[PDB]
Amino acid sequence: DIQLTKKQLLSMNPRKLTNKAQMDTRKEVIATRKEALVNAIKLPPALNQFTNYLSEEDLKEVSDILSKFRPETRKERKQRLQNERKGPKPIIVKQGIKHVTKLIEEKKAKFVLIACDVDPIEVVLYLPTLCVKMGIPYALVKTKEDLGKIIKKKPTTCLCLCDVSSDIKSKFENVIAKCNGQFKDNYESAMKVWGSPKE
Amino acid sequence: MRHSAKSWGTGRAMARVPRVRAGGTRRAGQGANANFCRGGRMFAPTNVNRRWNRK
Amino acid sequence: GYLQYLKEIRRDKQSSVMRYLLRVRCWEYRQNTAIHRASGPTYLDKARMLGYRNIPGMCIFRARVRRGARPKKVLKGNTHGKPSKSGVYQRKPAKRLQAFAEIRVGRKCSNMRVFNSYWVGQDRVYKYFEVIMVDPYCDRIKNDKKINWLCKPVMKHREARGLTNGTKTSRGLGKGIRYNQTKGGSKRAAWRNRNTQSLRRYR
Amino acid sequence: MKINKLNNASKALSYPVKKLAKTEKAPLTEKQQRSKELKKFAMSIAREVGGLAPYELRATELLRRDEDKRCKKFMKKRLGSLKMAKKKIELLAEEMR
RNA sequence: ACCACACGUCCCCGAAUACAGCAUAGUGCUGGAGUACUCCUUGGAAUUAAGCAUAUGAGUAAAGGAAGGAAAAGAAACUAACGAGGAUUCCCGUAGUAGCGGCGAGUGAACAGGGAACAGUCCAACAGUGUAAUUCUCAAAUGAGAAGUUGUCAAAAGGAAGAA
RNA sequence: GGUAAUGCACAGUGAAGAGGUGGCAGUGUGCAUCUAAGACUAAAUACAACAGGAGACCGAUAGCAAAGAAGUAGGUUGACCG
RNA sequence: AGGCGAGCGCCAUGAUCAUCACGACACACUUGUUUAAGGAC
Structure with missing residues (x-):
């Protein structure tokens, strides 16, 4: 009924909420107390990486390039197959951790985006070190939903692009230079600094 | 051997056979x-383990 | 591929990243009720070795067990017998602690079958496990080609008869001279075969 | 008793067969090579991301002081097997170099 | 008339429920009874040693959990040192032997050799990227929506025999 | 039975990608044989209730407790007894 | 790398890892001081 204040929720002992009626409150006590604990303790260097992400301004710039390579919907797909093959091979942005890791390993991938808010995190933890070893540029985004909006479908962990149309090439190269600044160029320094408790 | 039985022991002017509780x-x-x-x-109840055949 | 990278990290249990994650997760598991449903598997690689897929009619539950040996259930230490059978403490259970988790989840989730289970953490007081469950009365499952076998009537209550990965290990089954105590099917099957008198027709 | 009549020398005799040589399996195909490469690669990334464990640090410290026989005893007690200890010491030595 | 085969009707209490726990897009499922035989736990003492404390009776009795017409087991991280064999179960046998044991009382297996019956296969590691090709719902004769990229999806009808 | 550990557990500790075993503790080195920590499997084997067929079996103090309205008449505060 | 007694043990102080009290913070843990109090005991 009533929304409890932060002070109240931090005061309550979750193990003393026992009735079926109380379960939603038990969930909220746990959620708030977990936040306080994570802010209090130091993060290892590899986990600390996913605290650094693009501004909403840069996200706009990147999305305004990438949106032009949207995947086919089922409606579009049906039409295509009633018609004959025509024209050159399309460029499309690609999705999902299994395919992306393959394209990195084959040295096909040319630029990659990764989401931060992923649980459990061990799914994405290794991607930056692999990108640095293969020499591929990348950037980190705040939420899985930010990625979903680019390709007009359900949220995802990562997106990848393997080709560049000449029309876009000028803008593309500039974007890569911005990203290298915040991310790939800084990597060797980053892997040695522990995340401070937050003020 | 079905029944609940026990001996009454000596001192009752009776033979010390087991007797039926009822x-x-x-x-x-x-x-x-x-x-x-x-x-x-019966004494030594007849039993299936006997040797029926002969060589 | 991706599942290989996860395997190597999951094996390094004293790496800095794994010590961090074990500490935070074991804190959360103890604030929750003793058996509760999970949102998904904690470890994607491990759950997928053991037969999990993200289809309707499969679920993960999580369970905790108290640690250490289990004392003899007698009052004041009085055993009414011979002195060699008078010990109360330092008596260790026959089954793994994992087996207790599986048995308790199966009671709570009575409409479902227990498939397999795995370790997810420990602390001073508890040990924590995830159990994979399936629903045999579900249209999606009844028409699958890989787990449709769980719907056979003999598959009811595998955990109670020592048939699951966690419950099987105390039976002592195996191949070779090191497992002679279970030739026949079980310890009791070996006992019968060794303590019987055979009486042929001509003898 | 129909046991223990021959000497050990005569029990060791054997019939003269004609043997067949074993078919060696040394060729390893292209796809098998890439498979092995990718596994070894993955093992690098884990070590890079998460680092060494406490007893590995203590072990490597002793190797710098040339405390070879102390390190040997220490590792034996941690891993159980004298073989595993000999192997892990050789891997740690190569990492430091 | 009466009988035999099936169906219809079938008061109140009882798991007894207008309930408890739990899953799905949805429909739902469990609970009690029975338990000779099979599987999983827990676990005696009388008795024998001419006394008795280790040992024996015995991993038996008792008490709990669970399933089927059978149940369990099952295709070698297996034996063997022969000129070798080759899943599991059952019968004859090695054998009252090798050994265990106040080395006392007492306990006690395995391979071979001869047969019954015979059968091998799945998941993960590792799914078309010139487009999730996959499952479900409503409509419609070609549209809307749910699950799913933290990974879905790896194919045949069909038959005369045999028995009660 | 498993003998300087046959199998199973609990606490500390904790691998390698190459490892396990060869009925006596340890260290080294060739040789032989296998591949654990995920799953399924017919036939040949065991035995109540209920039904059918047989017998060098018992013949109303026998044979099941019970050849008739027998777990009945009747009994325990009760579990149970008959 | 210093100093003493016919390179020895003894006396000086300078780098390298654990480590026992004492402080001061809050995150585990504790308590109907609970929009709170303690506290690595």
Whole structure:
């Protein structure tokens, strides 16, 4: 009924909420107390990486390039197959951790985006070190939903692009230079600094 | 060997055979399990392990 | 591929990243009720070795067990017998602690079958496990080709008869001279075969 | 008793067969090579991301002081097997170099 | 008339429920009874040693959990040192032997050799990227929506025999 | 039975990608044989209730407790007894 | 790398890892001081 204040929720002992009626409150006590604990303790260097992400301004710039390579919907797909093959091979942005890791390993991938808010995190933890070893540029985004909006479908962990149309090439190269600044160029320094408790 | 039986022991002016525990029936106090008793068990009951055939 | 990278990290249990994650997760598991449903598997690689897929009619539950040996259930230490059978403490259970988790989840989730289970954490007081469950009365499952076998009537209550990965290990089954105590099917099957008198027709 | 009549020398005799040589399996195909490469690669990334464990640090410290026989005893007690200890010491030595 | 085969009707209490726990897009499922035989736990003493404390009776009795017409087991991280064999179960046998044991009382297996019956296969590691090709719902004769990229999806009808 | 550990557990500790075993503790080195920590499997084997067929079996103090309205008449505060 | 007694043990102080009290913070843990109090005991 009533929304409890932060002070109240931090005061309550979750193990003393026992009735079926109380379960939603038990969930909220746990959620708030977990936040306080994570802010209090130091993060290892590899986990600390996913605290650094693009501004909403840069996200706009990147999305305004990438949106032009949207995947086919089922409606579009049906039409295509009633018609004959025509024209050159399309460029499309690609999705999902299994395919992306393959394209990195084959040295096909040319630029990659990764989401931060992923649980459990061990799914994405290794991607930056692999990108640095293969020499591929990348950037980190705040939420899985930010990625979903680019390709007009359900949220995802990562997106990848393997080709560049000449029309876009000028803008593309500039974007890569911005990203290298915040991310790939800084990597060797980053892997040695522990995340401070937050003020 | 079905019934609940026990000996009454000495001091009752009776033979120390096991007897049937009951009440309300004429069966109370009768003599239970032994081969010399009505409704008791036979001596060395016949048994399936006997050797039926011959070489 | 991706599942290989996860395997190597999951094996390094004293790496800095794994010590961090074990500490935070074991804190959360103890604030929750003793058996509760999970949102998904904690470890994607491990759950997928053991037969999990993200289809309707499969679920993960999580369970905790108290640690250490289990004392003899007698009052004041009085055992009414011979002195060699008078010990109360330092008596260790026959089954793994994992087996207790599986048995308790199966009671709570009575409409479902227990498939497999795995370790997810420990602390001073508890040990924590995830159990994979399936629903045999579900249209999606009844028409699958890989787990449709769980719907056979013999598959009811595998955990109670020592048939699951966690419950099987105390039976002592195996191949070779090191497992002679279970030739026949079980310890009791071996006992019968060794303590019987055979009486042929011509003898 | 129909046991223990021959000497050990005569029990060791054997019939003269004609043997067949074993078919060696040394060729390893292209796809098998890439498979092995990718596994070894993955093992690098884990070590890079998460680092060494406490007893590995203590072990490597002793190797710098040339405390070879102390390190040997220490590792034996941690891993159980004298073989595993000999192997892990050789891997740690190569990492430091 | 009466009988035999099936169906219809079938008061109140009882798991007894207008309930408890739990899953799905949805429909739902469990609970009690029975338990000779099979599987999983827990676990005696009388008795024998001419006394008795280790040992024996015995991993038996008792008490709990669970399933089927059978149940369990099952295709070698297996034996063997022969000129070798080759899943599991059952019968004859090695054998009252090798050994265990106040080395006392007492306990006690395995391979071979001869047969009954015979059968091998799945998941993960590792799914078309010139487009999730996959499952479900409503409509419609070609549209809307749910699950799913933290990974879905790896194919045949069909038959005369045999028995009660 | 498993003997300087046959199998199973609990606490500390905790691998390698190459490892396990060869009925006596340890260290080294060739040789032989296998591949654990995920799953399924017919036939040949065991035995109540209920039904059918047989017998060098018992013949109303026997044979099941019970050849008739027998777990009945009747009995225990009760569990149970008959 | 210093100093003493016919390179020895003894006396000086300078780098390398654990480590026992004492402080001061809050995150585990504790308590109907609970929009709170303690506290690595």
